[PDB]
Amino acid sequence: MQGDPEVIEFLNEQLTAELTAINQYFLHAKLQDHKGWTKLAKYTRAESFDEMRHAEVLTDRILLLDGLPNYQRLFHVRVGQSVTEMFQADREVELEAIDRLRRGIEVMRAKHDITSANVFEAILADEEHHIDYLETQLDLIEKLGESLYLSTVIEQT
Amino acid sequence: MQGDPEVIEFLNEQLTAELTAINQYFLHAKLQDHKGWTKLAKYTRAESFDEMRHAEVLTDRILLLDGLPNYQRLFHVRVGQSVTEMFQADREVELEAIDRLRRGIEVMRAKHDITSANVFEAILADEEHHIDYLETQLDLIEKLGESLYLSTVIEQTQ
Amino acid sequence: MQGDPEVIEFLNEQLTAELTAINQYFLHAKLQDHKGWTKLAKYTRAESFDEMRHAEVLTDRILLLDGLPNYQRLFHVRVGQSVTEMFQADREVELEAIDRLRRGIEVMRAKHDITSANVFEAILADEEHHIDYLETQLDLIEKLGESLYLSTVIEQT
Amino acid sequence: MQGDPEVIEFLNEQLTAELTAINQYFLHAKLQDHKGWTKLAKYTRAESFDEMRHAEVLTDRILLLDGLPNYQRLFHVRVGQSVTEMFQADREVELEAIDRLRRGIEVMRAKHDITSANVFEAILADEEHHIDYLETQLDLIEKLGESLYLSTVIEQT
Amino acid sequence: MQGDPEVIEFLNEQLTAELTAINQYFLHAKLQDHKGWTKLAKYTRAESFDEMRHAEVLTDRILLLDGLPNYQRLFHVRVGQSVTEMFQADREVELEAIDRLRRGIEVMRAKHDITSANVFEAILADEEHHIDYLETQLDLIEKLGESLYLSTVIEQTQ
Amino acid sequence: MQGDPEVIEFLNEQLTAELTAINQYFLHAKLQDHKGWTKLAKYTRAESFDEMRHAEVLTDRILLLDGLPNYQRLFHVRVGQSVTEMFQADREVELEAIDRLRRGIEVMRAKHDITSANVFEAILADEEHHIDYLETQLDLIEKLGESLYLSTVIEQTQ
Amino acid sequence: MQGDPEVIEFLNEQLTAELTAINQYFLHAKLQDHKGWTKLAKYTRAESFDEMRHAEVLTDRILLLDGLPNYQRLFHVRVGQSVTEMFQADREVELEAIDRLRRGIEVMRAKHDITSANVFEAILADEEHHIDYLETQLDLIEKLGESLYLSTVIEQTQ
Numbered sequence A, C, D: 001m002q003g004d005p006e007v008i009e010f011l012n013e014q015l016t017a018e019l020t021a022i023n024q025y026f027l028h029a030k031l032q033d034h035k036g037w038t039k040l041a042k043y044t045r046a047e048s049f050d051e052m053r054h055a056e057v058l059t060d061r062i063l064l065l066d067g068l069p070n071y072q073r074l075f076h077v078r079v080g081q082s083v084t085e086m087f088q089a090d091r092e093v094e095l096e097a098i099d100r101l102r103r104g105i106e107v108m109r110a111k112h113d114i115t116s117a118n119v120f121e122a123i124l125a126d127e128e129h130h131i132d133y134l135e136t137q138l139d140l141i142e143k144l145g146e147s148l149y150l151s152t153v154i155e156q157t
Numbered sequence B, E, F, G: 001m002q003g004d005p006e007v008i009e010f011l012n013e014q015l016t017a018e019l020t021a022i023n024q025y026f027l028h029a030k031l032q033d034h035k036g037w038t039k040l041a042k043y044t045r046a047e048s049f050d051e052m053r054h055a056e057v058l059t060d061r062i063l064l065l066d067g068l069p070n071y072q073r074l075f076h077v078r079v080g081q082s083v084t085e086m087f088q089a090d091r092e093v094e095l096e097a098i099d100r101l102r103r104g105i106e107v108m109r110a111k112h113d114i115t116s117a118n119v120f121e122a123i124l125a126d127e128e129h130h131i132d133y134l135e136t137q138l139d140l141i142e143k144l145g146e147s148l149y150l151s152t153v154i155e156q157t158q
C-alpha cells in the first residue's frame, strides 16, 4: 500500500501544526504557573497532552502508508503576556487548524482514502470543542474584567 | 368513576402549564451552561426534573378519572439573555401557577373531590418554595451586582 | 464560527420532530400502563428516554453554532386506542424522521460541515433499529392475534 | 375530649364495613387458593391485610375520643363462584365504602374535627386505588376470556 | 407574597404559646430530675425538644410570608410541687393550644391560605396525642396512689 | 446547704441574660438564613446552642443550692437588619454579660462560695472568646466593605 | 478590651523567660546527645517542646488583650559541661520562674483579671513538677556517683 503524495503532504502539514501547538501550549502553561494562576495552568497542561496524543495518531497513520514523518519543521510560536493575549493566540492556532482540516478531508475523500478522512474528522471535532472553550473564556474576561476574573484562579498552598 | 368536566378542565390546564415550565427551565439551564455558569445550570436542571415529576403525577390523576390527557397544547415560552431576565420570567410563571392552583383547589373541594385537592395542595407548596428561592436570588443580585454575583458561580475544570 | 442558516433550519426541524416523538411515546406508555400491559410500558418508557437523549444532543449542536433552539412549536401527536394503532403511528413517525435525516445529511455534507452530518448519521441508525422492532411486533400481532399476543404481557404483581 | 355522637356513629359504621370486607377478602383468597389459581390468592391476602390495618387505625381513633368500638355487628358477606362474580362483589363493596367516606368527611369537617377527616381522606384514597385495580381486571377478563385469562395465573407446585 | 395581617397574628400567638410551653417543660424536667424521678424526666425532656421543633416550623412559616416573628413576649409559666400538679398544668396548656389551633385553622382556610392550615393541622394532631398521654398518667396516679406510682420511676444509679 | 440570697440573685440575673441571648441569637441565625447567608447562619446557630448549654449549667447550680430558678423574665431583645447592626448588638450583649460576671465573681469569692465563682470564671472565658470573634468580624467588614464581604458567604444548594 | 499595662508587663516578662528556657533546654539536649547520653537527651527535648507550648499560650493571651508581644529580648543562657551543672542551671531557671509566677498571679487577681491568673496558675503547676524532677535527679547523682549514674543512660543503639 502506497498513498498518494498529496495525502501524505496534508498529513505532514497537520503534523507540523500539531508539534507547534504542543510547544506553545506547554510554554503557556509553565508561564501561567510561574505567576500563581494554578487552575489555568492545569487546564493548559491537559490541552498540551491532548495535542501530544493527536501527534502520535498522525505519526502512526503516516507510517502505515510507507511515508517519512517530518520532525524538523516548526511554525511560528506565539507567546503572550496577559491572559487575553494567550487566549487570542490559541484562537488563531485553532482557526488555522480547522480550515486546513476541512480542506484536507475534502481532498482525501475525493480519492477513495477513507481512514485518513476519518482521522481528520475526529481531530476537527476536538479542535471545534477547544475553540468553543476559548471563546467562552474570552467572553467571561470581557464581562467581569481582568482582576476580578484572575481572583478566581489563584490558590495559596 | 367519572369526574366532573370542570375538574378535568382544571387538571388539564395545570398539565399544560407544567409542560411549558419544563421546556422553559430546560432551555434556560442549557443556555446558562453554554456561558460558563455551572452551579446555576445544575440548580435549573434539578428544577426541570421536579417539574417533570409534577407533570407525571397530574397525568396519573387524570387517567384515573377516565379522561383524556392533553399533550398538544403549549403556552408562550419566555427566554431571557441576562440572569435578571431569566429570574423574572420564572417568577411570572410561578405567580400564574399559584393563582390557578388556589382557584382550582377551592372549586374542587366544593364538589366533594378530595384527592385532586390534595394533589393541588402539594403542588402549591412546591411552587411557593421555588418562588421564595427566586426572590432571594433577585435580592442578592440587586445588592451585589451582576459581575460580583457571577464571579461566584464560574469554575473551569476538565 | 457561524453555521449556514440552512443547516440550522434542518437541525431545528429535527429538534421539533424529537420533541413531538417524546410527547407521543410518553403518552402511549402511560396509556398502556393504565390497561395492565406492563412489559410493553417498560419498553415504551425506554424509547421515550432515548428520544430525550437525541433531543439533548441536537440542542448542544445547535448552541455550539451560535443559533437559537426552538422549544415552542410541535407537530401533530397521534394517539391510538388499540395496540396495532399505536404501532402504526410510531411507524409513521419513524418513516418521516428517516426521510428528513437522509436529505439533511446529504445537504450538510455538501457544504463542508461534517460534525452535523455525523450526528444525523447516528440518529438515523437508531431510527432504523426502532422501525425494525416496530415492524417485527406488527408481524407477530398479525400472526398470533390480539388476545393471544396480549396474554403474554400481563402480570399480577 | 369527647367527640360528637354523630362523628362516632360515622366511625363505627366505617369500622363495621372494614370488618365485613376483611372477612369477605380472606374467604375469597382461600377459595381461589383451593382451585389452583396461585397468583390471585397472594394479591387477595395482601388486600385483606390492608383492610386489617384500616380497622386498627379506626379503632385507635375511636378509643382516643372516649367511645365504645363495636366488634359485634356485621353486614352481609358476598361469595362468588366464578372470578367475574368475585370481582363484581368487591366492586360493590368498594363503591359503598367510597360513598360513605365522602359523606362522612363532609360532615366531620363541618364541625371542626380535622383529624377524623384526614383519616377518612387516606382511607378514601386507598379505596379508589383498589376499585381502579378491580375495574382493570374486569376489563382484561372481558377482552381475553375466562380460560385464556386463567391460564396465566396457574403454577405447578 | 404578603399574607393577611390576621393570619400572621394567629401564627405569632401560636409561636408565643410554643415558647412558653418550651420553658415550662424544661423547668419541670429539671425539677423532676433533682428529686430522683429519672424516667419521668427523660419523657419531659423529649416533650420540650418536640416543642422546639414546633416553634422552628412556625418561625420558618412566618418568615416566608414577609412578617416579623415575635421573640419578646411570653405567657404565664406554671410550676407545681407535686406530680399531679405538673400534669394538671400541662393539661391546661394543651387545652388552650388546641382551642386556638382549631379557631385559627378555620379562619385561615376561609381566606385561601392552605399551607398555614396544614401546619396547624399537624400541630393539632401532636397536641391531642400529648393530652391523651397526660390524661392516662393522671388516671394511673388516681388508681394507684402517689407512693406506689413513684416507686416505679426511681432508679439507683448507672 | 443553703446559699446566700445575694449569690442566688446573681445567678438568676445571669440566667435571665442567658435566656435573652439564646432568643436573640436564634432569631438572628434564622434571619441570616432567609437572606442566603449560609456560613454566618451556621456559626450563629452554634453560638445559640452554646448559650443553651450555659443556661443548663446555671440552672443546675441554682437547683443544688435549694433555690427557685426564674424562667419568666426577659431583657430587651435587639434585632438588626444589616450585618453590622447584628454584630453591634451581639457586642453590646457580651459587654454587659462580662461586666456582670466580673462583679459577681468578686462578690461570690468574698463569701466562701468557690464553686459558683468557678462557674462564672468559665462563662467569662467563653464570653471573652466570643467578643473577640465579633470584633474581628467587624474589622473585616470595615476593611473589605459589605458587598465584597457578603460575596464570600453565599452558596447555591442541592 | 484593653488590659492594664502592668498585666501586659508581667505577661511579656514571662514570655521572655519562656524563650530563654526554650533555647537553653534545646542546647542542653543537643550537647547531651553528642556525648552518647540518649535517654537524658529525649527527656530534655520533650521539656523544650513543653516550653514552646507555654510560650504559645502566653503569646495568644497577650494578643487577645490588644498588646504587642516581645520577640526581641532575651535573658542570660546558662551552659554546663558536666551533668550536675546542667541540672543546677535548670533548677535556677525554675526557681526564678516560680517566684515571678506567684507575684504576677497575686497582682493580676487583685485587679479583676481572672483568665491571666488561671494561665499563670497552670504554668506554675508545671514548673513545680519540673523542679521536683530536677531535684530527684540531683539526689540520685549524689547517692550513686557520676560514673555509675551515667552507665544507666548509654545505648549502642545502631
Ligand code: HEM
Binding pocket: B019, B022, B026, B052, B053, B055, B056, C022, C023, C026, C045, C049, C052, C055, C056
Ligand atoms: C431534554 C429534555 C429532557 C430531559 C433531559 C429529560 C430527562 C429525564 C430523565 C433522565 C428522566 C428519568 C429517566 C428514567 O428514570 O427513565 C425523565 C423522566 C420523565 N420525563 Fe423527561 N426528559 C426530557 C424531556 C421531557 C419532556 C419534554 C417531558 C414532557 C413533555 C418529560 C416528562 C418526563 C416525565 C413525566 C418523566 C417521569 C418518568 C417516569 O416516572 O416514568 N421529559 N426525564
Ligand code: HEM
Binding pocket: E022, E023, E026, E052, E055, E056, F019, F022, F023, F026, F049, F052, F053, F055, F056
Ligand atoms: C429559653 C428558651 C430555650 C431554652 C432554655 C433551651 C434549652 C435547651 C437546652 C439546654 C438544650 C440542650 C441541647 C443539648 O444538650 O445538646 C436544648 C436543645 C435544643 N434546642 Fe433549645 N432552648 C430554648 C429555646 C430554643 C429555641 C427557640 C429553639 C429553635 C428556634 C431551640 C432549638 C433547640 C435545638 C435545635 C436543640 C437541639 C440541638 C441539636 O440536637 O442539634 N431552642 N434546648
Ligand SMILES: [Fe+2]
Binding pocket: A018, A021, A050, A051, A054, A123
Ligand atoms: Fe490537535
Ligand SMILES: [Fe+2]
Binding pocket: B018, B021, B050, B051, B054, B123
Ligand atoms: Fe410544577
Ligand SMILES: [Fe+2]
Binding pocket: C018, C021, C050, C051, C054, C123
Ligand atoms: Fe429520535
Ligand SMILES: [Fe+2]
Binding pocket: D018, D021, D050, D051, D054, D123
Ligand atoms: Fe378499608
Ligand SMILES: [Fe+2]
Binding pocket: E018, E021, E050, E051, E054, E055, E123
Ligand atoms: Fe407545640
Ligand SMILES: [Fe+2]
Binding pocket: F018, F021, F050, F051, F054
Ligand atoms: Fe452565655
Ligand SMILES: [Fe+2]
Binding pocket: G018, G021, G050, G051, G054, G123
Ligand atoms: Fe515554661
Ligand SMILES: [Fe+3]
Binding pocket: A094, A126, A127, A130
Ligand atoms: Fe486543539
Ligand SMILES: [Fe+3]
Binding pocket: B094, B126, B127, B130
Ligand atoms: Fe415551579
Ligand SMILES: [Fe+3]
Binding pocket: C094, C126, C127, C130
Ligand atoms: Fe426513534
Ligand SMILES: [Fe+3]
Binding pocket: D021, D094, D126, D127, D130
Ligand atoms: Fe377496599
Ligand SMILES: [Fe+3]
Binding pocket: E094, E126, E127, E130
Ligand atoms: Fe404539646
Ligand SMILES: [Fe+3]
Binding pocket: F094, F126, F127, F130
Ligand atoms: Fe456569649
